[PDB]
Design a protein around this ligand. Structure first.
Ligand SMILES: *[C@@H]1O[C@H](CO)[C@@H](O[C@@H]2O[C@H](CO)[C@@H](O)[C@H](O)[C@H]2NC(C)=O)[C@H](O)[C@H]1NC(C)=O
Ligand SMILES: *[C@@H]1O[C@H](CO)[C@@H](O[C@@H]2O[C@H](CO)[C@@H](O)[C@H](O)[C@H]2NC(C)=O)[C@H](O)[C@H]1NC(C)=O
Ligand SMILES: *[C@@H]1O[C@H](CO)[C@@H](O[C@@H]2O[C@H](CO)[C@@H](O)[C@H](O)[C@H]2NC(C)=O)[C@H](O)[C@H]1NC(C)=O
Ligand SMILES: *[C@@H]1O[C@H](CO)[C@@H](O[C@@H]2O[C@H](CO)[C@@H](O)[C@H](O)[C@H]2NC(C)=O)[C@H](O)[C@H]1NC(C)=O
Ligand SMILES: *[C@@H]1O[C@H](CO)[C@@H](O[C@@H]2O[C@H](CO)[C@@H](O)[C@H](O)[C@H]2NC(C)=O)[C@H](O)[C@H]1NC(C)=O
Ligand SMILES: *[C@@H]1O[C@H](CO)[C@@H](O)[C@H](O)[C@H]1NC(C)=O
Lengths: 182, 195, 320, 48
């Protein structure tokens, strides 16, 4: 349980669990690579406990232009579809709690958990990049998520003794813009 | 074809608003950086207040000096931070400027054979135009269209001697063989002058 | 790699009092977020410019006969679930609890927009286009041409007549097949080939580890633990102690970002050069000396690598 | 709501189409515990 703790002045916050560490009798507490208190021993029952910080991560918001609509979609990064918040009773610092946060359209991708967008089996051009080959766009009156399409399929008719030769041409003009000074 | 292509250029820039995003980003980042430097004057940095006048007018010099050292060091950090980003950004601007100088020499003052360097297609010529904090090029390119289907052979055998094209390629519609240039269909009879 | 840093968690952590003091320390946290976001976005742009040079996805016809030229080592393999060429998957193995500890300090790594399969799918399009259509597909519609006839075209580019190839078609095909096979052994035998790609991975990881070790520095303060300082000193005493810690840790974060901005600019220079090589050495034939290989350039074939690209330059070399 | 949090971050009342990084969530603690040794005798401070 995500609780505070105080071990002989070692104040902190986190989740205490069982530890498999082969603690030696003279050893008080363990440490990790980062040189931080990773495990502790209870002063009373002399039990070794793991210390793990309460769950956290970044949150990103996906929206079209406000000139177009007002709906949004929220992406929880690195959160694995299950530890997303479910209670708002003074146990989270983000009151922008999604109206369902479950049951509704929830998609799990390699970039995190996406709530508020509908996955489709189609493929269009990328509009808003999400990550790991998943894009999102506002289509129809709703926000949907798809897998980006590299391009139209083609197959050159390679043959054993066949050639293709143009009979007309086109004169084309294109522009290129480059900064020169600041 | 040339006049129509040049005509559609004005509408393409006017209609599409995000066409000049590359030049616009230069102006916005420079403006954004200056706004941050001004806004950073509002930070106490652990002192009692951000105003220098009241600190000196409310505490004795022996203890007020330590209060203003927090403000001076924090503000010097803002200036040092602001200069470091300017040096980095100017280095990437000079790289863009060098590419622009190279393109004007190679795509405007002559005809370039480097693929995709000046536009998409086979390069014909370029025209420069001046823009705020940058330049704009108009690449003119030759694009083939309306290809056809033909049967080809590497060499033509006649009188026990192999014949090869001099600067073209052998084609036939199915009954009669010709020689044509590679980029344009203009068939001709096979003689001893083109082979 | 693209990195995301939690400004508050790295500096303060679980100390609520530190979070309040950081509010009056200016808008440094916001600046760090914007600077690192620009680097992360740029990384997706670099990959797009090099690989997405074509708008269509060409495919190679089933009958793999090209006048004696194998192409087996460079074409995609259906048997592999990743659908990579036998050379490509050899590259993915040469280039390679620590992640967890860094995450708990607020340092995260974001996944790229383009997956490995998607990138390998792009290189397959450029292979099919460059074989079945020569250089034509880089300037408009793709026109088919027999591969032996396409080689005769490339011989004229370097000043050698067509009949030279046609009279030595069997021998030239044998030489190309032998050279390709020796390429795989050179990489497989020698593990030091991918030194350039490894340094990018090493320097990023090693720079990040330096940031973590900076969290155990007193910076002149009594202790390097925020909770102890608050739980041992009265409020007007602790302020002169937290300030040293906060400024010491703010300096470390600013130092890290500055090095990353410098490194990103160097990478973009290398990325810009690779996009030029693909347009000139793969989508066409180049007359620039030593730009695409050593010798007289004939053609090139690209192969996808982890955080990179590999060019195989085919060149003509006089002898005897 | 999540849309308004974006407006606060950008310092604008109008937002262009895209994805933005707003903030970080974390699970708040519920209760607190204290663990101290079991001894009770008072230190002999009267003597000194
Ligand atoms: C040139 O001929 C080839 C066949 O030799 C054509 O390739 C196929 O043609 C059939 C019909 O003739 C189409 O249904 C296929 O889609 C074509 N492609 C393939 C990969 O089989 C080719 O279309 C002809 N070119 C033109 C311009 O008509
Ligand atoms: C192009 O022509 C050659 C003959 O010069 C064909 O080569 C043979 O094709 C047959 C038919 O599939 C195969 O059974 C033989 O094994 C091929 N010989 C060799 C040495 O490979 C070739 O297949 C033709 N290409 C196409 C697409 O028809
Ligand atoms: C090459 O293209 C041009 C235009 O794309 C073709 O000319 C057109 O011809 C038709 C009927 O002959 C006219 O109705 C159009 O007005 C012409 N176009 C223009 C722009 O004036 C021309 O026929 C094509 N050539 C070949 C051989 O296909
Ligand atoms: C293939 O090209 C030949 C080129 O000679 C065409 O032959 C000519 O056809 C026209 C009308 O069909 C006649 O007036 C000419 O006298 C023909 N020339 C010769 C030299 O015979 C032929 O029509 C084309 N198309 C095919 C063979 O299908
Ligand atoms: C050239 O192509 C042939 C088949 O067209 C390849 O022959 C087989 O290749 C596999 C490896 O891909 C080997 O395990 C088999 O032993 C080969 N069979 C024979 C009869 O040699 C050949 O490997 C290709 N060349 C290269 C360099 O890959
Ligand atoms: C949920 O997602 C992660 C992605 O890194 C995956 O490794 C694992 O299945 C889950 N993570 C944890 C910490 O259990």
């Amino acid at each position: 349980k995500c609780v505070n703790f105080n071990f002989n002045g070692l104040t902190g916050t986190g989740v205490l669990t069982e530890s498999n560490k082969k603690f030696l009798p003279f050893q008080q507490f363990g440490r990790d690579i980062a040189d931080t208190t990773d495990a502790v021993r209870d002063p009373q029952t002399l039990e070794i406990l793991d210390i793990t910080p309460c769950s956290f991560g970044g949150v990103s918001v996906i929206t079209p232009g406000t000139n177009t609509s007002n709906q949004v979609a929220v992406l929880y990064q690195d959160v694995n579809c299950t530890e997303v918040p479910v209670a708002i009773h003074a146990d989270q610092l983000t009151p922008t709690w999604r109206v369902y946060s479950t049951g509704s359209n929830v998609f799990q991708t390699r970039a995190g958990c996406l709530i508020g967008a509908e996955h489709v089996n189609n493929s269009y051009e990328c509009d808003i990049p999400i990550g790991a080959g998943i894009c999102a766009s506002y289509q129809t009156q709703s926000i949907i998520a798809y897998t980006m399409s590299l391009g139209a399929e083609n197959s050159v008719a390679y043959s054993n003794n066949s050639i293709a030769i143009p009979t007309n041409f086109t004169i084309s003009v294109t522009t290129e813009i480059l900064p020169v000074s600041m | 074809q040339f006049n129509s292509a040049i005509g559609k250029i004005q509408d393409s820039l006017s209609s599409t608003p995000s066409a000049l995003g590359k030049l616009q980003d230069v102006v916005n980042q420079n403006a954004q950086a200056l706004n941050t430097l001004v806004k950073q004057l509002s930070s106490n940095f652990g002192a009692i207040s951000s105003v220098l006048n009241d600190i000196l007018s409310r505490l004795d010099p022996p203890e007020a000096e330590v209060q203003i050292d927090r403000l001076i060091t924090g503000r010097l950090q803002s200036l040092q931070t602001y200069v470091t980003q300017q040096l980095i950004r100017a280095a990437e601007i000079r790289a863009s400027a060098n590419l622009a100088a190279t393109k004007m020499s190679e795509c405007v003052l002559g005809q370039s054979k480097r693929v995709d360097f000046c536009g998409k297609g086979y390069h014909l010529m370029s025209f420069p135009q001046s823009a705020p904090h940058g330049v704009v090029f108009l690449h003119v390119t030759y694009v083939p269209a309306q290809e056809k289907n033909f049967t080809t052979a590497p060499a033509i055998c006649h009188d026990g001697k192999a014949h090869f094209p001099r600067e073209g390629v052998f084609v036939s519609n199915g009954t009669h063989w010709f020689v044509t240039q590679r980029n344009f269909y203009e068939p001709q009879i096979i003689t001893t002058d083109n082979t | 790699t693209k990195t995301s840093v939690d400004c508050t968690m790295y500096i303060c952590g679980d100390s609520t009092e530190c979070s309040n003091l950081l509010l009056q320390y200016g808008s440094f946290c916001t600046q760090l977020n914007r600077a690192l976001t620009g680097i992360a976005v740029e990384q997706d742009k670099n990959t797009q410019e090099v690989f997405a040079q074509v708008k269509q996805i060409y495919k190679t016809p089933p009958i793999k006969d090209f006048g004696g030229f194998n192409f087996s080592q460079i074409l995609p393999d259906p048997s592999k679930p990743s659908k990579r060429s036998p050379i490509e998957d050899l590259l993915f193995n040469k280039v390679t609890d620590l992640i967890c500890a860094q995450k708990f300090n607020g340092l995260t790594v974001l996944p790229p927009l383009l997956t490995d399969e998607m990138i390998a799918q792009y290189t397959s399009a450029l292979l099919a286009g460059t074989i079945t259509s020569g250089w034509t597909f880089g300037a408009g519609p793709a026109l088919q041409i027999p591969f032996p006839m396409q080689m005769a075209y490339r011989f004229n580019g370097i000043g050698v007549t067509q009949n030279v190839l046609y009279e030595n078609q069997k021998l030239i095909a044998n030489q190309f097949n032998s050279a390709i096979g020796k390429i795989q052994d050179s990489l497989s035998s020698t593990p030091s080939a991918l030194g350039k790609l490894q340094d990018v991975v090493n320097q990023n990881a090693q720079a990040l580890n330096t940031l973590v070790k900076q969290l155990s520095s007193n910076f002149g303060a009594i202790s390097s633990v925020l909770n102890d300082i608050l739980s041992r000193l009265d409020p007007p005493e602790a302020e002169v102690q937290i300030d040293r810690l906060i400024t010491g840790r703010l300096q470390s974060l600013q130092t890290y970002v500055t090095q990353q901005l410098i490194r990103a600019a160097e990478i973009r220079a290398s990325a810009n050069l690779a996009a030029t090589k693909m347009s000139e050495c793969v989508l066409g034939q180049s007359k620039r000396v030593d730009f695409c290989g050593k010798g007289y350039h004939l053609m090139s074939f690209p192969q996808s690598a982890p955080h990179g690209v590999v060019f195989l330059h085919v060149t003509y070399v006089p002898a005897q | 709501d999540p849309l308004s949090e974006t407006k606060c971050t950008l310092k604008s009342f109008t937002v262009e189409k895209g994805i933005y990084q707003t903030s970080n969530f974390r699970v708040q603690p519920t209760e607190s515990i204290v663990r101290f040794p079991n001894i009770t005798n008072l230190c002999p401070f009267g003597e000194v």
